[PDB]
Amino acid sequence: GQMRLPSADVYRFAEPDSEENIIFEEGIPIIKAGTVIKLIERLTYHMYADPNFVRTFLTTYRSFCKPQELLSLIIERFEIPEPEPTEADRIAIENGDQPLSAELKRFRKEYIQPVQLRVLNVCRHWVEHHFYDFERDAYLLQRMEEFIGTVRGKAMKKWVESITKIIQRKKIANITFQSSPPTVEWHISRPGHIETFDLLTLHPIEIARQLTLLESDLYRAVQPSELVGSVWTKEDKEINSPNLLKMIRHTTNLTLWFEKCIVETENLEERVAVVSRIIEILQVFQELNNFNGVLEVVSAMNSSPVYRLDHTFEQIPSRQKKILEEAHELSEDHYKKYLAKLRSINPPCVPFFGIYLTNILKTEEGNPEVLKRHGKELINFSKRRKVAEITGEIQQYQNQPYCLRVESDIKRFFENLNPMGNSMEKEFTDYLFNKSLEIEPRNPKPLPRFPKKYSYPLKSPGVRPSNPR
C-alpha cells in the first residue's frame, strides 16, 4: 500500500489533491493550475524529480509569491513529522525487544529523505541561478544562511555543507576550445592605428568578427530577471533591465551607423563601395550565425533614407543583391525563415532578441494570473511555464562561446561608436533623410554629382579568410 502521511492539520502538504487545489494538463504530470501549497508540494515531490519545473518555478514565482514567503514555505515543507510506533513496534517494546520500525524506516527512506533533498535542490538552484533575490534583500540571505546552516543529521550533511560554501562564494563573486581561433585580419588600418579605423579601412572580416564577439557578450549578459513581469517595458526599465537595454542600444547604434556611412557618402561610386562593403560584413555575420548582426544590416537597408536610393541599388553587383535579399527574406512572414534557420544551425550563434521580447510580453498580457475553479482562485501555472519556455530557449543559446580572438582596439572602436553624437533621435533621423534627399533627389529633379571624400583605395579585400604559416 501507499505510505501513510502526517495529518494535514500538522503538515499542510499532506492535503489530498482535488480540483479545488490542483489541476493537471491532459510520464510525470504537468500542472495547469494550483494553490501555492500544491505547487511547492509538486516542486519537491517524493515520487520524482522535476528539474525543468524547478527552473520554471524559480524563474517565474515572484508573480504569485514573495521571496520571503517562498523561503518560509519551503522551510515548512522541509520540517516533516515522523510517524509514531506501530502496534507491532509497541508489542516488541513491551517485551524488551528492539522494534523493527518497518513503517518508520520506509517513511524516512521514501518520503522524508527525497522531499528534504528536493527542498535542498530548490535552495541550491535558487542560490546558484537566481541569486538576485538575495542581492536585493540582505535579510532574505541571512534567513537562507541560517536555515541551511542549522540542518541537522547525516543524510543531508554533504549537501548542507556544500550549499553553505556555495552561498559564501556567491557573496564575493575561463574557456577551453577544440581548436585555435583564426588569425586577426587587417586591411588599410594597421594594428595600433586606431585613429584611422573606419568602415572601409578595417578588414570587413574583422569588423564582422569583433562585432560578433561584442554582440555575443551583450546577448549572453541578459538574465531572466530582466524579462519576467515584462519589466523592460515599464517605468523602472533602466533599473530592472540594464543589460537588455544596453544590448538593444548597441543594435540600434550599429544600424544607425550603417545608415550614416551610406548617406554621408555623397559621391555615387563611393557610396556603392560603402553599401557593397556592408553587404560583405553581412555575409560574414551569416557565416558566424550572428543573426542580431544580420538584422542590424537588414534594418539599415530597409530604413527610409537608404531604401529609396535607387541609383545606388542599381549598381550593387547581382551576387550581393542576392545575399541581401536572402537576409531580408529571413524577416518576411513574421520571421518564418529566421525562426527555422535559428533552430537548424550549429551554435555558437547570436539570436535576434526582439521576437523573444514580443512573445514574453504577449504571453504575460494574454493569459490570466489566476483560474477560478469551485469558488477558489488557483495560480495559472501554465502561463508561467510558457514564459519559462522562452527564457529557457534564450538561456540555451547563451551557453556556447565563440572561438574568435578579441582585438582590444577594434573592440573599443565599436564600443564607443556614437553616430547620433549629441543630437536627439528625431533631429538625427531627419538629418539622415534630408541627406538622402540631397544625394539622390526625388524625380523629376536631376541627379547631381558630388566629389570623392575617400583618399584611400575602395577595393574590398573580400571576405574569404587568409592563413599564413
Partner: protein
C-alpha cells in the same frame, strides 16, 4: 480567392497596446493566448458581407529597437496608431508615428486609424474631445477601445479595413 490585408499596430510601449490584437485574434470567449503559435496573428473575418483575411503585425515589446520601425512599418498596408488614454506622452507621440508612416510609405494618404486604449482603471488624462480633434485634423477615424472588455476592438480593425477598401 479572398483578399488579405496586412495591418500594422504602432504606438508607445508599456501601456497595454498589445491587448488590442490579443483580444481580437483571441478565442474571443476564452481568455488565453500562445503568441508563438504560427498564425496566431491571422484571422478570417467578414466585413460588410465580404470575407477577408487579416494579417496583423504587432511588435509590442520591441519599442526600444527604434531603428527597426521603418522595416516593420514597410510591411503594412494600413496602420492602427495606438495611445493609452491615461498616458499623455503616448498621445503626444502620435504625430511622430504618423509622420514616420507617411515617410516610409512615401505617401501623404496612408490608410490609418487613431485608437485610444483604456488599459487600466487609472485616471484618464486624454479626453475624447482632444483625440477626436487630433483625428479630424489628420482626416482619419478615431476609435476608443477597452483592454479588458473587448469593447471597440472589432470596430478599430474593421474601420481600418474600410479605410483600405475606400482608399
Amino acid at each position: 480567392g479572398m483578399t488579405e490585408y496586412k495591418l500594422v499596430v504602432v504606438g508607445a510601449g508599456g501601456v497595454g497596446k498589445s491587448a488590442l490584437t490579443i483580444q481580437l485574434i483571441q478565442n474571443h470567449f476564452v481568455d488565453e493566448y500562445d503568441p508563438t503559435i504560427e498564425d496566431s496573428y491571422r484571422k478570417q473575418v467578414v466585413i460588410d458581407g465580404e470575407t477577408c483575411l487579416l494579417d496583423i503585425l504587432d511588435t509590442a515589446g520591441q519599442e526600444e529597437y527604434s531603428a527597426m520601425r521603418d522595416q516593420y512599418m514597410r510591411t503594412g498596408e494600413g496602420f492602427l496608431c495606438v495611445f493609452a488614454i491615461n498616458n499623455t506622452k503616448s498621445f503626444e507621440d502620435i504625430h511622430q508615428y504618423r509622420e514616420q508612416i507617411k515617410r516610409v510609405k512615401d505617401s501623404d494618404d496612408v490608410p490609418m486609424v487613431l485608437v485610444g486604449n483604456k488599459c487600466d482603471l487609472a485616471a484618464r488624462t486624454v479626453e475624447s474631445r482632444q483625440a477626436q480633434d487630433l483625428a479630424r485634423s489628420y482626416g482619419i477615424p478615431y476609435i476608443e477601445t477597452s483592454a479588458k472588455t473587448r469593447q471597440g476592438v472589432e470596430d478599430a480593425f474593421y474601420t481600418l479595413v474600410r479605410e483600405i477598401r475606400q482608399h
